[PDB]
Amino acid sequence: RFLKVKNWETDVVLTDTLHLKSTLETGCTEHICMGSIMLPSVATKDQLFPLAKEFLDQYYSSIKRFGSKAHMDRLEEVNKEIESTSTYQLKDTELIYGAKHAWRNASRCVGRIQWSKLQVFDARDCTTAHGMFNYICNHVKYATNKGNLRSAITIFPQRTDGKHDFRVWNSQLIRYAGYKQPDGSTLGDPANVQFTEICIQQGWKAPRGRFDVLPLLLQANGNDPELFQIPPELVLEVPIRHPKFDWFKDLGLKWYGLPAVSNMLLEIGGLEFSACPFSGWYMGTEIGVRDYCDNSRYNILEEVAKKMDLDMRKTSSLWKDQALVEINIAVLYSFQSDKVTIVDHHSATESFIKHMENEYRCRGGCPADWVWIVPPMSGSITPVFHQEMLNYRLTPSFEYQPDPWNTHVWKL
Amino acid sequence: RFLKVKNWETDVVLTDTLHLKSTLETGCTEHICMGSIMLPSVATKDQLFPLAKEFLDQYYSSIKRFGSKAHMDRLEEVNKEIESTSTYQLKDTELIYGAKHAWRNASRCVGRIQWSKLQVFDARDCTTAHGMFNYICNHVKYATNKGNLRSAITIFPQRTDGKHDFRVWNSQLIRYAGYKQPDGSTLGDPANVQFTEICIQQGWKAPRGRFDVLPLLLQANGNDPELFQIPPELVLEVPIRHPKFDWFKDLGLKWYGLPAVSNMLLEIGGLEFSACPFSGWYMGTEIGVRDYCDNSRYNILEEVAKKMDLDMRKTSSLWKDQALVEINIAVLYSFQSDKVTIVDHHSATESFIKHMENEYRCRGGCPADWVWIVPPMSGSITPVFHQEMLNYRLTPSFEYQPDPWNTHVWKL
Numbered sequence: 142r143f144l145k146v147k148n149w150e151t152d153v154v155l156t157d158t159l160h161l162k163s164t165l166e167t168g169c170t171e172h173i174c175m176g177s178i179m180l181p182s183v184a185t186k187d188q189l190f191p192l193a194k195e196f197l198d199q200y201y202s203s204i205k206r207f208g209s210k211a212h213m214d215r216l217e218e219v220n221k222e223i224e225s226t227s228t229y230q231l232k233d234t235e236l237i238y239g240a241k242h243a244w245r246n247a248s249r250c251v252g253r254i255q256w257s258k259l260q261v262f263d264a265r266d267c268t269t270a271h272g273m274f275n276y277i278c279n280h281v282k283y284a285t286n287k288g289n290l291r292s293a294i295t296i297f298p299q300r301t302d303g304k305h306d307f308r309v310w311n312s313q314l315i316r317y318a319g320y321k322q323p324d325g326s327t328l329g330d331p332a333n334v335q336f337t338e339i340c341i342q343q344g345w346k347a348p349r350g351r352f353d354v355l356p357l358l359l360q361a362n363g364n365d366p367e368l369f370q371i372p373p374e375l376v377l378e379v380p381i382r383h384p385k386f387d388w389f390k391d392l393g394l395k396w397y398g399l400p401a402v403s404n405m406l407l408e409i410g411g412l413e414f415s416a417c418p419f420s421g422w423y424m425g426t427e428i429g430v431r432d433y434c435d436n437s438r439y440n441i442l443e444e445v446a447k448k449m450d451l452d453m454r455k456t457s458s459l460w461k462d463q464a465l466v467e468i469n470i471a472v473l474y475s476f477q478s479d480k481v482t483i484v485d486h487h488s489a490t491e492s493f494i495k496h497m498e499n500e501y502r503c504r505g506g507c508p509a510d511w512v513w514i515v516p517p518m519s520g521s522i523t524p525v526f527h528q529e530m531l532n533y534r535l536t537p538s539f540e541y542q543p544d545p546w547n548t549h550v551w552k553l
Numbered sequence: 554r555f556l557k558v559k560n561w562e563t564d565v566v567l568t569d570t571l572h573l574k575s576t577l578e579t580g581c582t583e584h585i586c587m588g589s590i591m592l593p594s595v596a597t598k599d600q601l602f603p604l605a606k607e608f609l610d611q612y613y614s615s616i617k618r619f620g621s622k623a624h625m626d627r628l629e630e631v632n633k634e635i636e637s638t639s640t641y642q643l644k645d646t647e648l649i650y651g652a653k654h655a656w657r658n659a660s661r662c663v664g665r666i667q668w669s670k671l672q673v674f675d676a677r678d679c680t681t682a683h684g685m686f687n688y689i690c691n692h693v694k695y696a697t698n699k700g701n702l703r704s705a706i707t708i709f710p711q712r713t714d715g716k717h718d719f720r721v722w723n724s725q726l727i728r729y730a731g732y733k734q735p736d737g738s739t740l741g742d743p744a745n746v747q748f749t750e751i752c753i754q755q756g757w758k759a760p761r762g763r764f765d766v767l768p769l770l771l772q773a774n775g776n777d778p779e780l781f782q783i784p785p786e787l788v789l790e791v792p793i794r795h796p797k798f799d800w801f802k803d804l805g806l807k808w809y810g811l812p813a814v815s816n817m818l819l820e821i822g823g824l825e826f827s828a829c830p831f832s833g834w835y836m837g838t839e840i841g842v843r844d845y846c847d848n849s850r851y852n853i854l855e856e857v858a859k860k861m862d863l864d865m866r867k868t869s870s871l872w873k874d875q876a877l878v879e880i881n882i883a884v885l886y887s888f889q890s891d892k893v894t895i896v897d898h899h900s901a902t903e904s905f906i907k908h909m910e911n912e913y914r915c916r917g918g919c920p921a922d923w924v925w926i927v928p929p930m931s932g933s934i935t936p937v938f939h940q941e942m943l944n945y946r947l948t949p950s951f952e953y954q955p956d957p958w959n960t961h962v963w964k965l
């Protein structure tokens with residue numbers, strides 16, 4: 142019940158007790174493990190006070206006033222307000238705590254050593270999509286900080302009945318457009334083709350190129366969403382060059398500096414924040430491995446092998462591997478020379494081992510998803526490959542949610 | 554109950570029903586996933602006939618005589634023999650079926666497309682360690698086949714009381730010695746230092762070098778084990794050279810061509826074969842990534858970076874990654890030019906996707922351990938990264954077992 146995890150590179154063993162406080166279900170059973178399944182699987186008052194109480198007991202245990210009068214009266218207060226409204230409202234201090242701990246609990250995030258340095262932007266007074274555009278722009282400008290990136294989250298009003306939802310329809314605040322072609326191939330980013338089409342359906346006029354930043358599709362209070370274009374001066378981009386290969390520029394590649402996930406759901410004390418865009422800084426491999434070399438993404442291993450002069454007829458020449466390293470040396474090199482914050486997969490995985498140590502020490506554990514923590518290249522030469530990890534679901538949490546254009550009781 | 558697994562590169566979905574026949578427990582619960590834990594965790598007659606019956610019902614269902622008289626009388630026969638002896642003996646046909654399906658069921662093995670082409674060597678008449686040495690030598694010579702490697706397993710007598718166990722004490726039939734140093738560092742293979750010491754404790758005279766093949770430590774019928782040296786003409790080795798870098802030879806590296814795991818336990822119909830050495834052929838990354846570049850193994854990334862002239866002061870120069878690719882191009886190149894069978898991680902992972910397809914088609918599923926199937930470099934540019942997999946325990950199976958020098962009621 143009080144399980145051990147080993148590192149098979151350093152022989153370090155650590156004991157996990159945190160998993161006892163785990164609440165939600167993982168998808169695994171005693172007879173089947175779903176640890177590699179990507180997405181395994183309205184609320185009433187009777188369900189809502191337990192979740193409220195559990196969250197408040199840990200918040201007040203955190204500020205070292207567990208059981209004081211201020212705790213007891215807040216308990217009473219929220220119970221009464223859930224009696225009164227069949228929902229409730231978080232204190233500002235509770236929102237910041239809940240948001241910081243949703244990140245802390247995010248078992249798929251290798252970056253969590255930073256979890257206590259999160260800037261929280263309270264957007265619960267927002268009422269319109271223009272208001273959301275304005276809040277989001279302020280978030281982008283703050284988090285970018287001239288390339289000295291800063292972690293931030295903006296939190297729009299919580300779900301009420303369920304038909305009044307605030308939603309950012311984009312999967313990230315800043316993504317490149319995806320257009321198919323007459324010849325069937327694809328320009329830009331194939332991941333976003335169905336989303337790019339929706340933007341044009343709502344009247345986006347597309348500069349049908351490669352690295353065309355997409356417009357925001359913001360839905361406020363369950364209303365049909367509206368398009369807004371981020372001031373291009375606010376979208377910071379890094380041109381990608383190699384520190385040896387001068388033909389690299391002719392590839393004409395760039396990426397955006399701000400990774401900002403906008404499609405997930407923030408759960409705190411039982412309340413559900415359906416729009417909660419959050420940003421940090423990139424680990425290089427997200428760009429250089431997945432974005433650039435996934436077969437169903439930009440898929441550029443072809444032309445980097447070509448302009449490197451490689452044995453491309455033989456699978457066993459490892460020409461794919463060798464081009465993959467050069468691409469990631471360049472992504473890193475270009476961000477660094479521009480003073481735009483980026484972390485390499487060696488530094489980031491070392492920090493997560495160090496973070497894990499602190500979590501077992503002063504928290505009794507750290508939920509971690511090995512399938513997602515291990516980088517998507519050079520896995521075993523980073524220390525997280527050799528680190529056993531336990532995955533379990535703690536709350537506050539970030540959860541997946543359906544794409545809104547499948548939920549929306551649209552009125553057009 | 555009848556679960557689906559998706560490939561997020563090709564959008565292919567396949568339905569798993571095989572997991573229903575799963576029997577053993579995984580280590581996961583509804584509230585915690587142990588999919589990254591390496592080793593999660595005598596027999597009576599009452600337990601033994603169910604296992605015997607379950608195995609026989611699938612064997613006879615396999616040869617398309619489910620429920621015939623030959624099935625019914627074999628059922629009766631084995632029941633009577635477990636009444637008589639409180640154990641039983643497999644038919645030759647049943648041993649070959651059981652061994653081929655233990656491999657088929659091995660969820661951590663990416664090579665299983667070959668599972669039906671296994672040569673089974675029945676060594677259940679063996680009574681002495683010399684006999685084991687002789688059986689093992691015949692296995693090594695057959696499986697090597699002049700570099701045209703052939704899959705094989707040799708099966709020594711099954712466990713009886715438990716104090717009469719046949720055991721190969723080495724973890725692989727062919728491993729390099731591991732000696733520490735006065736200055737604390739290590740020559741050879743640090744993985745094997747405690748085993749190499751045991752060999753010297755039993756009187757092995759060590760050529761204290763790097764690539765010194767270790768002697769066999771064979772235990773027969775629960776007796777104290779004995780040392781035997783494999784005729785060096787039978788240990789095929791590949792000298793590792795690079796197809797571009799001529800300084801590669803000066804590194805003076807070689808590896809053995811035959812991967813042959815000797816420390817696991819083969820379970821069939823409830824019977825336990827504690828010595829069952831089995832061999833195939835290498836996937837390059839086992840040598841070039843893990844054996845050579847694991848920090849606690851040969852750990853040669855240092856000198857390959859050095860003789861490549863690389864930016865070794867900066868973690869973010871990806872000098873480790875870039876040296877790692879060249880090492881694996883060389884491992885492959887050297888094996889191929891010597892006509893010694895080897896598979897690259899791209900070909901082997903493609904074949905396992907194809908194998909998975911056949912298993913869902915004609916078997917209803919394929920148990921697979923993602924954490925182990927994904928190669929330890931370049932993970933996401935191989936198709937198994939993007940393939941969801943279900944892990945569950947089917948029998949016949951290969952299981953881990955304690956190291957014998959911790960179990961053995963030694964009489965010296």
Ligand code: HEM
Binds near residue numbers: 420422
């Ligand atoms: C500060 C620097 C950060 C770094 C270096 C980092 C690193 C990463 C990486 C590499 C991933 C994997 C993404 C993928 O493979 O698609 C990830 C996922 C994730 N991160 Fe972090 N992150 C950072 C900040 C944050 C912040 C500020 C939050 C929330 C407030 C967060 C929460 C998450 C979540 C929930 C996921 C999973 C998203 C998904 O399932 O697609 N991270 N992070």
Ligand code: HEM
Binds near residue numbers: 667814
């Ligand atoms: C024919 C070519 C084969 C290839 C290319 C292959 C490939 C692999 C690889 C890469 C591993 C991972 C080893 C590690 O990372 O330590 C593995 C493990 C394994 N293989 Fe296969 N294999 C082959 C044949 C076989 C055979 C003949 C058997 C049994 C009869 C087998 C059963 C297993 C088992 C049980 C494991 C897990 C061992 C462990 O947990 O350390 N394989 N295989």
Ligand SMILES: C[C@H](O)[C@H](O)[C@H]1CNc2nc(N)[nH]c(=O)c2N1
Binds near residue numbers: 527528529589926
């Ligand atoms: C902690 C982790 O489970 C451990 O390092 C595993 C990960 N995956 C692996 N996969 C393979 N094929 N071989 C290994 O030794 C390991 N090691």
Ligand SMILES: C[C@H](O)[C@H](O)[C@H]1CNc2nc(N)[nH]c(=O)c2N1
Binds near residue numbers: 178179938
């Ligand atoms: C099938 C598999 O779960 C899927 O491809 C996962 C594997 N691990 C991952 N890990 C990260 N960080 N990001 C991903 O998109 C994925 N994809």
Ligand SMILES: CNCC#Cc1cc(C)cc(N)n1
Binds near residue numbers: 252401402419422423
């Ligand atoms: C599909 N998830 C995409 C992503 C992402 C991500 C998000 C954050 C906050 C940081 C980071 N380094 N990456």
Ligand SMILES: CNCC#Cc1cc(C)cc(N)n1
Binds near residue numbers: 813834839
């Ligand atoms: C720790 N397991 C080591 C191993 C191994 C192995 C075994 C077989 C049969 C084939 C292969 N390609 N590799």
Ligand SMILES: [Zn+2]
Binds near residue numbers: 169176581587588
């Ligand atoms: Zn699991």
